[PDB]
Amino acid sequence: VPLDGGRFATSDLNDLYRRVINRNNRLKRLLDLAAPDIIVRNEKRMLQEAVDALLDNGRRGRAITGSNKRPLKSLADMIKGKQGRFRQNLLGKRVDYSGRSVITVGPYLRLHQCGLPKKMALELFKPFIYGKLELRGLATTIKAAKKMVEREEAVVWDILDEVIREHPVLLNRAPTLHRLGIQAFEPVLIEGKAIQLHPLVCAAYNADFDGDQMAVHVPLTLEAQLEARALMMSTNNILSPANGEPIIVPSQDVVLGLYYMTRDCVNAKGEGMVLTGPKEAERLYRSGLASLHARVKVRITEYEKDANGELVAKTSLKDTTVGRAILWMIVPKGLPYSIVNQALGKKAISKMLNTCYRILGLKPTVIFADQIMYTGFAYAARSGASVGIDDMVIPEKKHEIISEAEAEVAEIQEQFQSGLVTAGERYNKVIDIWAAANDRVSKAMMDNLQTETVINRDGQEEKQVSFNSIYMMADSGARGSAAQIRQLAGMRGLMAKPDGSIIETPITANFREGLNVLQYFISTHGARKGLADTALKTANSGYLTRRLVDVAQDLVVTEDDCGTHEGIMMTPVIEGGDVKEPLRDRVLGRVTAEDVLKPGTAD
Amino acid sequence: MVYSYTEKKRIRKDFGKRPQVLDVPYLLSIQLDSFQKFIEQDPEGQYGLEAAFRSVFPIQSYSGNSELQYVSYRLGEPVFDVQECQIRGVTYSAPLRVKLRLVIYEREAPEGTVKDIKEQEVYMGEIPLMTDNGTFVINGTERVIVSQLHRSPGVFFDSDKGKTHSSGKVLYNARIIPYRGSWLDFEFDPKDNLFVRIDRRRKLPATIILRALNYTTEQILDLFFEKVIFEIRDNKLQMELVPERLRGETASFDIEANGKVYVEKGRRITARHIRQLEKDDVKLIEVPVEYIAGKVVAKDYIDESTGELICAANMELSLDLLAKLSQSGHKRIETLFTNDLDHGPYISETLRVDPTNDRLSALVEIYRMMRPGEPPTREAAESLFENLFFSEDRYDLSAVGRMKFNRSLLREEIEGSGILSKDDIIDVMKKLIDIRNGKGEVDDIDHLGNRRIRSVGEMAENQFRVGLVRVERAVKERLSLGDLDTLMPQDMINAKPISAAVKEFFGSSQLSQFMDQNNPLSEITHKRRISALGPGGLTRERAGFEVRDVHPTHYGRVCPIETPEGPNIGLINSLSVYAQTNEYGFLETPYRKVTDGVVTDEIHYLSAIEEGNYVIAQANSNLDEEGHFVEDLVTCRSKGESSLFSRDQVDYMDVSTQQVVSVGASLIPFLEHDDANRALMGANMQRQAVPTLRADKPLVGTGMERAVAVDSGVTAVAKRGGVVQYVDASRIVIKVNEDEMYPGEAGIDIYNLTKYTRSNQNTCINQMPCVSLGEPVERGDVLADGPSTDLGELALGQNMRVAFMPWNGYNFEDSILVSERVVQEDRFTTIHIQELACVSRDTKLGPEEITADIPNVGEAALSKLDESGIVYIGAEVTGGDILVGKVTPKGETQLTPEEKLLRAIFGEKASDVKDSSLRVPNGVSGTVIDVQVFTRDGVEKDKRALEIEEMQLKQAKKDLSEELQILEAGLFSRIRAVLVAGGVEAEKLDKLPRDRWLELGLTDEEKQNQLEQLAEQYDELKHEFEKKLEAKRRKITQGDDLAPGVLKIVKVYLAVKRRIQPGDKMAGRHGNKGVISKINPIEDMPYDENGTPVDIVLNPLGVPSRMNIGQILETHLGMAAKGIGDKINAMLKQQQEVAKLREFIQRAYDLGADVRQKVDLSTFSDEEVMRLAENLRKGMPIATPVFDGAKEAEIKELLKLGDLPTSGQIRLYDGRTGEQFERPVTVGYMYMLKLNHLVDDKMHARSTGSYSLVTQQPLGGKAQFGGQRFGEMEVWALEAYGAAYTLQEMLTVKSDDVNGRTKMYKNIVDGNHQMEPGMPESFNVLLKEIRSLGINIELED
Amino acid sequence: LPVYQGETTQTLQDYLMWQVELTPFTDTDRAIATSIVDAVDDTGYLTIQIEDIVDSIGDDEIGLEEVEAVLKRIQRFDPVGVAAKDLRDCLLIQLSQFAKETPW
């Protein structure tokens, strides 16, 4: 590995080896003349020492370098350590068709797609591009192809797209927390400097499409293609293979719109408007209707696959909501339109999804979810959903609750001053007082922003589901929870822990009121802590994890049946007050032993 | 009176509630004062080299009757100019020349000086000057000498209790960290016994030190323990006791109190019992002999007759030995106390545990540990012990260390010796054992009273001292060897080691770091950080978490959110707005004394030890005009747990809301609702800026960016100039005023700006001028303008209007959706410049020559090349054509009949050289802005090179000619005026110079005399000018020093310019990011009621999740400012009345809460209003404090005054089908900026990449069209696929296989669709490494 | 380390071999081409004559005409004027590569 233009510098690659050869020669010169004992013994000792250093410098002695006190890495220090031939060498190597890819967000192009940027392309497709050109005879010579590529014909764009059609690639995220992050999907040529994905596998690749990356994978063999399109395909990566649980579900603002569609303040315009359904698009789409519609009757022809392998339609005249009838047009046949009979929430979105996926089938359910995403992507703008200062309105009871908690604290302090209340008694009681006042103010604010609204009607009082955006967020269930609003709405809370102890003064203000100097400086310990928490704990986590993966490197099923009744029993953990969980999931997909029988005797 | 003339062009709306008292400091006091003192000559040798030389200076020969002295030292003025070094490539370094004094004294004469060489000075190296902008200039690059903040030297009473004990015990250690030497430790073991530790080795006896320290066991006990008299004469078994002295033990029996038994037998000790016992005098009262048996003998007594060693010391008394002693030795003997209730010996135990009893034996074990073998000869151990700690030139801990221990000893003085002292460690063990038994509070690590940030100046002082010792020894050696000489004090003078060490510790290290010039903030802060990393602090980022907490004394010290995203977080602490430095090594913060409640204007710089003392409040408060307090109950900090404090409680007041933050955040926009998560995320996205095409000023920032510029130093401040003369596309000339003019100088300023100059990390950083002409300028005024700022504001960015509303799949969470306008509007374009070069290398096979005569080459490639090969300056680049056209000469050809016929046919080539040329980097293209070249002396080619030489000369020449002309005018006028009143009409003296008729004799007396003098001075100036000219011209072709390798070193530089694109990374100061990924045309941008195609649509589905209440708080403000501009803009578009827009302005400034005073129509003359508006060109600039910013009611107020939705609700028309949709949204114009990690800095592909020579492994990562390396968690997941063929190709197709990649490409062309694995070659490599190790390695069948 | 950058290179003759591998060739054709490649000069002229190559092939079936045909099929593959063989017809092949549209 020459450095300066002049000298090679295989330092210890031979400097150890060369020193060894040199001393060896010196010996071959010396002891053959009946060596003096002192010299010969010292030399042989150095010889053992140096040979060891070449094999294990660290055991005894040291093999430090010129201008560097650091020792020399012996022959197995090329075997031992983090960066050896035993560095990530059970397959951790630098690869061919990929690299350091930036990402876009695929408003269009449903899951049966993957947005591959055209810029990175054809430096991939080039071997295949040349194969196509020669098969097309577009350049009888390889150099002819090389220049015509260096010429960059647009007919090449045509050829690449034709290849880019029937050849998906594989996509992935890095710190591979799963077999869930990496996707194979239908690649598509696109123009810019980022690759777009459907709002689907946003969970799969598991990062979040900000300053980040994804990966490019070239399934070279046809078997690679068939497998990834059948295995690495996200066309099946819904249910959490561990949890069984469908990971794939719209949970972003597509939900927010889905909710906005089926709601009703009290009674919108012509709330008694009723139809059969195909023209609801005409009416609300023309005018006269809002998704805020109440009591709109609708002749609904639900279908049930009640017949064995056969669905029987069934026409009702159910009254429903505007967007309810709409998404009823979205759904396929089987679900009772009572599926559409909902306030239509996030968990519900998942729930209908589950009902379907149990019910219909894979392509069916997938298409349903996809168009679901489509409709939501329409509605959220068809909503839009402003935000603003006033949607934060503090319930007025806050000032009085504060005055009262302060009164309690002052009473505790005066009691401690009288000596009747111990300081620790003062502390525990004051903690209780603050907690109680906090709960009270929390309830006050929540009522201020619960389903609380006065609307015009015949009764002139129809307290309905209100219309603040943030409370709607906590409700339908997209981004945040009640805790988020409260801190931005109620006081900062106790949050009183420099390290573990409870700071007496509680941080008492919301994002509405700002904060205080001491308040913010207080707020910093836990924040830097939690960041450092994710930081350092990733480490021990991965360590244990690899420990496991090694510990499970050979695990497989080789037999179908054991022919044995031995096992352990599956029983509910009626633990604490009750069962933390029903004994339902723990054996949901079970195969009990020959021990299953009815509660009746001999039954 | 905000004259603020350069700021009279544009000011920000303020609402800053609390009023300024002491503004920002120079914001650069740090990397300035220390090095300033480093090259400061002081009356006392007290700092810098003043002491450091005073250390290792005088060398006395090995009794050669010869000693060495010195007079004074000099560091030079420059070699080259700063930019000159930038051009050539040189380290800005200045020599150190020190006068030496070498005296030969005659023998047999007591210091009888005989001969002296007190006349030979040594230039001991070329030392580097810290820059005016505090930078380095060594070997070229831009670097920051990052300091360290680390543990102070002194007494640290370590606890080390709990979990490390692993025994359910709380330990009590004693840690001392000297600045020089090892560490002496008095550890404690689980056995209630102390342990001696030094330099992290095996345990040493606690008693080892004392006995080795000539301390007898008798002395050791007499000091260590207090002994009762215990006078039992005539078998009285009576002892003298004080119930105050020892108490708290139940009286077992034989408890009688001066007659009457006050303590019953078996009666528990009572405070009433102790009080009554103290009430009456107590003599020696008989005690049970059982109290003797446990009693340990204090003194060693011998019998009165025989000096027997009976009753050895540190031994519990034995009744039989008690009788023997009471009969033989005496009646009274010293005994022990060891009140285990309140005390514990812990010393007699280790004294018994002590194996060596003599000072020699004790000193011997010390070496036996230190040297495992090589037993000393009773002098080597003694010498090692004395020179180990009793030496002044080996440990010399610290004088601040002296103050530190002395305070830790509560010693009235604080100035000590760096050397060891016995009373020190004695009291040290005393305190350790005392706190173990409980006497005071142990120290604290993450608390601030104990650390210092270790500067640069003494660091270099130290490196110099380190070298000074290294040569002092050889100085002594030469003074011993061949001392028979009276030569110059240069005999062993080799400064090469000195220069090498100073450079290396500075240069190639981690102590400093190559400074980057991203946006002004990069330097605004990367000169302002404190971390423990390096030689000091936390030797690894691993091995520490506890100090990474939010420290309580640390507030106005480190910045509040400023720490990286990762492993060095929590510890890279950012100096504060109120930052000062302690007297010793630490940092304080100024503080207004709340004197009797009244806030003294006096600010006292306050640090940790002081900080916990007085009573300290929070500023977010009102204060009365008398200075009286608003509320009587004020939450206040006393010792890190703040609480309400009386109006008679708080002792001080701070400065201002800037107390809590540095600037490295304080340029954060309106965090009053920002999440802390958002907070640190935001700032560590804040510095990521690089400049754009046009600078457009932030509309609502914090208010200091002007000041930041005042120190950001990227434009020209106007020091001492009065009238601007010449400003040109690279020149600015300003002629000073006489009142401020110092005579004998020209009195005019010519300042040069570097256009098109790549910066530290290769940006566009162009200082571009301000005024046009005919302008007055005040002292220090900015006129240039470096990048990404405009007319005086550190704005990494500019207002683009945007709206928050979900839409159509482009807004999942984190996409930023701007429409086609800015792509047309260029708003934020890029311009970046990477460097280039070439080399010559006169070789053994022959010098390579730059002639663009590459054999077998195309003319077009050569066509851009000129005769030099230096391509004509100014062309485009695309592809990889050769830029520098060099050829490598090779060995000559023989008769060579084939080559003979070749040179006969073509000739002139003979293949004598090979095309050895330089080209444009792959995929990297552009056009040049300037170039460079280094010709070492010894070659004078100068092909296209003399062009730059000449252009440079032209510039400099025109430059000198200016001053020449000006002073020439002064003189010619002085002459024609001297010719005035001489009857000499100016028609003649104007007609020709003519030496003014060569003193025509108008007075012929003093006019003759004055004329002679004037012609004299005239020629004098002519000569002086020509002389400076000649020196400069010599400097022109002065020539550079290349390495011995390449004969000439030509350096190239070009440009590349970028616009935001599909795939871009912008962000806003509320820390929200975005992947810019769908730019629609102008139509689909949502249309307003006036239809205005709004620019940027974001996802809104997060404003709660990370607390983006601040982003919308702005957005309200931002819409408001666009509106305020709209009103004024229509007003001007009407060309309305001057006072019309005037009242508009005064009103717009006048609404809201009362903060600060700004008023027009009494100060600005009308055109100052005229321009003041003409600049007011899209919105009124507005500034708020982070923590004293505006109130929301003000926003609601502002939104009506210019006819805007204070609600912020307003409809729109859709961009494709255009039905007005619900949700009347809020929108704004919140400024955006661009970070590094460019989209163009990303994408990369390769299908046949470099399989290595070693392992035929990939080239690397895009490095030569290299690629990625797969992921192990992913590969295991792949196993989850069982994607067997995928693995098969990934390791056979997608590994090193030449024999496999070849057949694979062949088939891939052939459409065969198969892979041939064979066998991995890394397998062969490892198999060899096994056979390389002691292993026969093979595979059977 | 022992490897540092550890990247291999073409050295031209192997770059010629890279093209030969993609070029259609027989075992005797591959052997003749490889032998021709073996004695190759830096300038790109043929070190040994066609007759020496025929002797090196050591095949009576291998003749001067077959050697010439193999060399010519490989004479201008990369670059023009490779294996010049007493360069003179090499510049001739180089010009022949240029179109006749060039005057003179």
UniProtKB/Swiss-Prot annotation, chain A:
Post-translational modification: Acetylated on several lysine residues in the presence of glucose.
Protein function: DNA-dependent RNA polymerase (RNAP) catalyzes the transcription of DNA into RNA using the four ribonucleoside triphosphates as substrates.
Use of this protein: Co-administration of salinamide and rifampicin or salinamide and myxopyronin suppresses the emergence of resistance to both antibiotics.
Highest taxon in the source lineage: Bacteria
Coiled-coil ranges per UniProt: none
Family per similarity comment: Belongs to the RNA polymerase beta' chain family.
Amino acids binding Mg(2+): 208, 210, 212
Protein name, UniProt field: DNA-directed RNA polymerase subunit beta'
Gene name of this polypeptide: rpoC
Outcome after substituting residue 483 to T: Resistant to antibiotics salinamide A and B
Subunit description: The RNAP catalytic core consists of 2 alpha, 1 beta, 1 beta' and 1 omega subunit. When a sigma factor is associated with the core the holoenzyme is formed, which can initiate transcription. The rRNA transcription and antitermination complex (rrnTAC) consists of RNAP, NusA, NusB, NusE (rpsJ), NusG, SubB, ribosomal protein S4, DNA and precursor rRNA; S4 is more flexible than other subunits.
Residues noted as binding Zn(2+) 2 in the record, renumbered to the chain: 562
Effect of mutating residue 486 to C/H/P/S: Resistant to antibiotics salinamide A and B
Residue window of the full protein shown: 253 to 855 of 1407
Phenotype for residue 445 to V: Resistant to antibiotics salinamide A and B
Swiss-Prot record, chain B:
GO molecular function: DNA binding; DNA-directed RNA polymerase activity; ribonucleoside binding
Stated name of the protein: DNA-directed RNA polymerase subunit beta
Matches recorded under Gene3D superfamilies: 2.40.50.100, 2.40.50.150, 3.90.1100.10, 6.10.140.1670, DNA-directed RNA polymerase, beta subunit, external 1 domain, DNA-directed RNA polymerase, subunit 2, domain 6, RNA polymerase alpha subunit dimerisation domain, RNA polymerase Rpb2, domain 2
Record note on modification: Acetylated on several lysine residues in the presence of glucose.
Effect of residue 561 to S: Resistant to antibiotics salinamide A and B
Mutation effect (residue 813 to K): Disrupts the enzyme's active center
Catalytically driven reaction(s): RNA(n) + a ribonucleoside 5'-triphosphate = RNA(n+1) + diphosphate
UniProt-listed Enzyme Commission number(s): 2.7.7.6
Effect listed in the UniProt record for changing residue 680 to M: Resistant to antibiotics salinamide A and B
Subunit structure: The RNAP catalytic core consists of 2 alpha, 1 beta, 1 beta' and 1 omega subunit. When a sigma factor is associated with the core the holoenzyme is formed, which can initiate transcription. The rRNA transcription and antitermination complex (rrnTAC) consists of RNAP, NusA, NusB, NusE (rpsJ), NusG, SubB, ribosomal protein S4, DNA and precursor rRNA; S4 is more flexible than other subunits. In pull-down experiments interacts with CedA.
Alphabetical UniProt keywords: Acetylation, Antibiotic resistance, DNA-directed RNA polymerase, Nucleotidyltransferase, Transcription, Transferase
CDD domains for the chain: RNA_pol_B_RPB2
Variant or mutagenesis effect after changing residue 569 to S: Resistant to antibiotics salinamide A and B
Stated role: DNA-dependent RNA polymerase (RNAP) catalyzes the transcription of DNA into RNA using the four ribonucleoside triphosphates as substrates. Resistance to the antibiotics salinamide A, salinamide B, rifampicin, streptolydigin, CBR703, myxopyronin, and lipiarmycin can result from mutations in this protein.
InterPro entries, alphabetized: DNA-dir_RNA_pol_bsu_ext_1_sf (IPR042107), DNA-dir_RNA_pol_bsu_external_1 (IPR019462), DNA-dir_RNA_pol_su2 (IPR015712), DNA-dir_RNAP_su2_dom (IPR007120), DNA-dir_RNAP_su2_hyb_sf (IPR037033), RNA_pol_bsu_bac (IPR010243), RNA_pol_bsu_CS (IPR007121), RNA_pol_bsu_protrusion (IPR007644)
UniProt family annotation: Belongs to the RNA polymerase beta chain family.
Gene Ontology biological-process entries: bacterial-type flagellum assembly; bacterial-type flagellum-dependent cell motility; cell motility; cellular response to cell envelope stress; DNA-templated transcription initiation; intracellular iron ion homeostasis; nitrate assimilation; regulation of DNA-templated transcription elongation
Recorded consequence of changing residue 665 to E: Resistant to antibiotics salinamide A and B
Organism of derivation: Escherichia coli (strain K12)
Effect of residue 675 to A/G: Resistant to antibiotics salinamide A and B
One Pfam family recorded for the sequence: RNA_pol_Rpb2_1
Gene for this chain: rpoB
